[PDB]
Design a protein around this ligand. Sequence first.
Ligand code: HEM
Ligand code: HEM
Lengths: 89, 378, 55, 73, 100
Amino acid sequence: KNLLRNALVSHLDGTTPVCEDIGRSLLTYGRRIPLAEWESRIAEVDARVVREVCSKYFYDQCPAVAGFGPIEQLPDYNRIRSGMFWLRF
Amino acid sequence: INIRKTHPLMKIVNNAFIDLPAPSNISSWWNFGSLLGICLILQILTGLFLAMHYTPDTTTAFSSVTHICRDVNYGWIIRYMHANGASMFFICLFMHVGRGLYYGSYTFLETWNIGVILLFATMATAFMGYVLPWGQMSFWGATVITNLLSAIPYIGTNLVEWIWGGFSVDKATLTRFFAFHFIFPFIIAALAMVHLLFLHETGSNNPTGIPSDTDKIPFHPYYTIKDILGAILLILILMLLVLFTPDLLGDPDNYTPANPLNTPPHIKPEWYFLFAYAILRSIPNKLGGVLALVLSILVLVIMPLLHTSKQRSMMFRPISQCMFWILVADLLTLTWIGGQPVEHPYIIIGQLASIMYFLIILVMMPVASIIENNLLKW
Amino acid sequence: LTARLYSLLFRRTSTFALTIVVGALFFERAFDQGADAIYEHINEGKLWKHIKHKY
Amino acid sequence: GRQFGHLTRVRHVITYSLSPFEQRAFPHYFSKGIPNVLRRTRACILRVAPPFVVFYLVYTWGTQEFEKSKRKN
Amino acid sequence: KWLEGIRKWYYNAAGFNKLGLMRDDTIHENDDVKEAIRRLPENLYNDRVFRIKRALDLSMRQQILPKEQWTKYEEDKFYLEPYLKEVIRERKEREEWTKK
Ligand code: HEM
Ligand code: HEM
């Protein structure tokens, strides 16, 4: 949460990145989110929401892999999948 | 980081079973190695339960086997698993060797020689096992093969007096055979580990014979689940064979006490030795026959030193392929001639089949090989 | 309908192993009764429970 | 022999693979696999047969010769 | 001569044309052939490894390419023969220098 606060503040620096954030917010969200709303949604998450979201999105899903270069010693895709879920290994 | 790459045992397991680069080409013909290993430990287990219920006294050996099959709980399924698991053990042995020959994997010297030493150990082990029940066929086949060892002048006469324990197969011969049958599968397991070591040092093969160093795949969980599928197939085969007609292969004559005077006229060992037995009696000499048996397995030694084709495989040389399937039909011919006693048509075609065996494997593979060498502008 | 069963009893691997053990003893019960009913049906008559009931 | 990584040097290759869950287990199994196994059958059995049919005929012929020795006596 | 027909029928039925493998593709590899594979230009090496990788895939699935992609005896492109010649002649040179 602290890194999210400080990085979002320093992301809101100058005028050109901030107005870029303005345009990208008014396209998708339909609005620009105030920084107090950002800080409120930061404080509205503790470890419970974090482990639920990691349970929904990370845990035992089907990823997409892009490999480029000297990638022969990359494990094959079934190794990634059978390492994706824990039976506590 | 991980236990698997920093622990001295899981380094070995990681380099044998997990990070082993497997070729992505092998068909079900390559499944017989893991099936031989699982049959080996299953034979160890069933034999060990047999050893917990067995009394090697020759007067009471037959009764002991009887009490195993009757009053010890499940002693009949353990005994039938041991005998017919030995049968399927030699079946998977023959498919393993036929794989390693026909798909040209016998370019390797040392793994092949270790395999042949394994063949000697398994043949002697299975014979000692077959002698152990102390039945009629066991007793007389023991006498026959002991005398074939006595066939050598000047070198082996005291050797056979030594393995006799006396005048003939006495009780001491039975306890010697119990001990060697009871130890030699562990020597088989150690030499199988050395077999596996030289293979995992050099590398596997593939159906085409092309070196597959561009398409390696991990061993787990591809061939692990593939060999478990092969294991379930082998288990259903062996359990059908021991739960519907368990006397499909074993001799009916071997269920009598060892009458030391009879020699019933339909004497033969079990089917797996019979083609090795067939080369013997279709050659009109004692010493020439026993030397020809030894030279049969030594032909299996020699065969990597006669490869003069500039391919590795036989997947692409169809004339040599035809000759090899002729050798297959000749093997099963020798098996059936070993399955029948000595009669005049059988004498004719027995000499025919044994001469054709030696003449194909000694001579015909280099002839078809040099035909295939010249025939493709080489 | 399969997705609802995946949501219930296929995610945490400890409860997964425990519930397939529960299903394994369930299968023990059903399988022994199935084998006994089938084998007695193909051997109606010549089984010792019949003759012993008549003794 | 050794592990991955140090085996060959291959440029110029791009490989596509799909997740096993998205695909079916048997996409057109019987409707393709039976012509495939008949094709593998047709591509081999003329190389397979001339040992085995000759073996079976020699088996029946030597069987007839032994039986014919045991027909008159 | 009819022996050309023998070789043509033989290459037609000899398997490796069906997978897309030329004459230089199913070679047994002792150390001489490994020297010959090392002594190769880059793009021909790349064509060799691409044919091999496709052949490994085809022999895995036991699937054979269509009639449009087989190689015929009219178009047997053989390239590995001179390098193989030179390595054999050098090995015979070393044998002569040891038996001279
Ligand atoms: C080291 C573990 C083993 C032990 C302790 C063991 C022990 C025994 C015993 C006590 C018998 C006599 C019981 C009987 O004949 O029915 C026997 C029989 C036999 N064993 Fe083993 N055995 C072992 C492994 C093997 C292996 C690896 C083979 C080869 C595949 C083998 C092949 C046989 C054969 C062919 C018989 C004869 C079966 C018969 O004629 O009744 N045994 N073994
Ligand atoms: C004692 C019984 C034997 C056991 C338990 C055994 C076990 C194995 C195992 C586990 C493998 C590795 C998996 C695989 O097959 O690729 C293997 C490979 C091999 N074995 Fe054996 N083997 C036995 C007998 C033999 C014999 C008698 C020979 C012939 C001399 C032989 C020749 C080979 C060869 C050539 C390979 C490598 C084939 C390839 O690269 O694909 N084995 N064996």
